[PDB]
Symmetry: D2
Subunit: 282 residues, 4 copies
């Protein structure tokens, strides 16, 4: 399918050999200020757009918004930016993605390490871009990653990595338990990204070796181990999850460019869930 | 939502304090032989009497909603998955086998480049999996270690999570709806919805991130399944394998081994759904 | 498909030769008082039910509610009753259906006739059932219809009719313009009913012969000619529409028994649209 | 919503004050020859240049999203044209719409009148356009309608009408009984059109006054299509015909005759969608 989402939908198209690629976002509420200025940035962070509908006098008409850019994932990033601004206005949410692994160089991301949790609570995109294209906010390994990326560049090879994404200030209740639990929506979103080979949330895979007691005990003051969900619905705590990407044309700069795509998809999932939540709030 | 899937749909219900729990499967083709005998087994593999309430006449599918009731909850899943599995058994020769590959710190080796591991994927069966007993690990050099581990933590009135691994073979090519609904995304959506699951990975997954491009795609390292049976979001005819971590929790600590039938069920529903959608577009 | 609706969903099952038929309603908000007492009446109006989930202490858990009754449309009527009560609480909406034709006996239902508009504004189910099983609230033709029904009963034949449905106190904004305009949702709902051969709203078919000016002029004080929708969304005015039913086993009491089914489907479509509307209210 | 359909989907956009309007069709199978030449005609029949922006390579479908831009319901007509050709190749289906009422001038369309059934079995779009812009294929009233249209044009007024649509050579089985019966899909399609105030199929509203026996009897003094080509909510291989009233009101009063391409377009999308879904379950 090329349509993503239930109430906040995005439909995409785009070949490559062809003139243009774009998408139609439908479900955006009327009001919201929206110009190409709101979109272009996230598109710059992947490296021209024109809104063709859904706006009058720089505001949303609450009708299909079609964007065209002069297969493909700019549809994603673009429609994500709309989603992100929707969420900015209606909730104060921050979504920040960053690189935590490149080949064998792993940034430490243990859910029980309070240094890692401090990173999740404070990291921002400004901070992430500062560290340069490698987009790792841990200096004790960023340049090692760059090193590693150059090793494999030298051999005309390539190497994958891991992106990590945190979301904060998310209201509670988001998620549709049973089949459409928040993390399942998020997992569906990340695995659809080109090159991604999985998804894990909170304690994920590493916490499998750590016991029950240590997960839920209030002193180990207990950290976010769930990844911000309980019973498939947002519990108000931060959300963080990680996505591995494969290397292979090659890259090997694949992982760092995923950041805006991981953020975009996270935005769409989150905007969609906010609508669906609002719908049932009585 | 309580409805899962596009053409092969399952809708579920069930409290616990309440008398029964069940589900309605819709989209099942008419024909297929189906009695409670087809369902009960996978339900036994979770431990609960079942009755088909519609969708069949003379032991065959009417191609109408099939409602099953069992005397929140995931028996809806296992049950409706059993229907899905048989649909797949008839129309494709597909085998879905799940097994335990980690319990606490005891890891069975599951490297996509290790041809011993790939031999496992090509031959493993549920019979073989259950033989090893409730721990459902088919590697003896760590099964009993896992059992040991499960007892340690039982001793301390604690618990510990694990990892289930699932392989799918003889899957026809073309399954998957690239762009947004790529097979692996449908699969990932399916596994993360399972209670206690904290992620999903396919093929080379997370460990393959440290291995270079060349070593992934080279025909000699004779190249093994590293993709996990998908390219461009659609089945390539090679085996599908993926893994799902489960958290410990009340406790368990027998959570991971009991997920097997739930991992298989969801895989079945995803796979039967995608077969329908693929058939739909075959011209 | 056996699933109906987007956010307020109902999934149904039931053969006949089989022991029991039912449905699962999903999307119902938690809170709402609900016992079998709320359902049984609309079921009695078609002529035993048990809620099997979704309630605790006589209140909704906001989880799937499964109902079983000891192909079929009781799934409809039953789930519709939940939908109706949802709407009763959250809006003060009245849905009333009645018989307006049986064979060649037509009750007069011209949208420009203020007598007819008076009926639409005041008719109630009490009033409808009073007239007896024929469920026509115009005495100058009810007994003619009964007469008609008896003629064709005599010849071991049958004859169809027309049900008419009015909805009032509906909030404005309900409807999803472009493809899922309220009247399209309602038309999809009515045509799926067994035996129904169409749907018309407001001025419908008869108003095709009346000119534009007479439709929109404030003096002809202008009456409801639209049927309560503009641009595919509820405008706060009453909604009324009509559905023909075919005769053929036979009946010939088909039309009068459709009343509870027409009301049920109206309920489902309306509760669904309210949810979707709430979702986008910002 | 702006998305229409389940497997054969169309998503649309377009303001008016804006430069351009269009739509993305998704679900179109790869193969089918498709250039702007396939679309432009139906667009001419509404009166606007069109460019395919994706989904094609070397004048053939890639089986990917096809995006069309036109320099609102042209999204409909355009995407309908793709749908129509899909149906032309894979089924030999003919969809013809025509005007059967304008104000008080009614073409006779009684399902029991074999003259009317003859019209349904033979009418074609060529024949319809021939009669000129009024698009009524009954001369004993076409010019009366034109007259009627002119009366009200004189008073700076307007008047609605009724379009009627026949579909033939439709394969049996199309339709998803219970909630998504073919006629309900079609009703949903027609009522979404701007200005439409209803929908009726087969015997419709007039047949309510005719008895059961006369509907089903193999001789009425040989049984005609009274069902409108559906039984139990699924196509029975007989012709489908249905009618949609349009309201007058800016004014027009040429509203009804311009709806023809829109009614055809929507019928196309509904039919192509149902063919896919049907194909999906054929086993």
């Amino acid at each position: 399918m090329s349509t993503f989402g239930k109430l906040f939908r995005v439909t995409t198209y785009g070949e490559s050999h062809c003139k243009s690629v774009g998408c139609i976002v439908d479900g955006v509420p009327p009001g919201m200020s929206l110009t190409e200025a709101d979109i272009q940035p996230q598109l710059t962070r992947r490296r021209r757009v024109e809104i063709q509908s859904g706006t009058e006098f720089g505001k949303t008409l609450g009708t299909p918004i079609a964007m065209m850019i002069k297969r493909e994932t700019i549809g994603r990033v673009a429609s994500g930016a709309i989603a992100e601004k929707f969420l900015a206005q209606n909730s104060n949410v921050e979504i920040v993605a960053f690189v935590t692994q490149i080949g064998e160089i792993k940034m430490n991301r243990d859910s029980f390490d309070p240094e890692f949790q401090h990173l999740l609570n404070t990291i921002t995109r400004e901070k992430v871009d500062s560290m340069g294209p490698i987009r790792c906010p841990d200096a004790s390994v960023a340049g090692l990653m760059v090193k590693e990326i150059e090793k494999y560049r030298g051999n005309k090879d390539s190497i994958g990595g891991v992106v990590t994404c945190v979301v904060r200030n998310l209201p509670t209740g988001l998620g549709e338990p049973c089949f459409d639990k928040l993390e399942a929506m998020l997992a569906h979103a990340m695995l659809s990204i080109p090159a991604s080979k999985g998804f894990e949330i909170g304690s994920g895979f590493q916490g499998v070796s750590v016991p029950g007691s240590k997960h839920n005990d209030p002193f180990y003051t207990k950290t976010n181990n769930s990844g911000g969900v309980q019973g498939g619905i947002s519990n108000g705590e931060n959300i963080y999850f990680s996505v591995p990407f494969k290397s292979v044309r090659h890259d090997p700069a694949v992982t760092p460019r995923a950041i805006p795509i991981v953020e975009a998809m996270t935005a769409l999932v989150l905007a969609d869930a906010l609508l669906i939540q609002k719908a049932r709030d009585f």
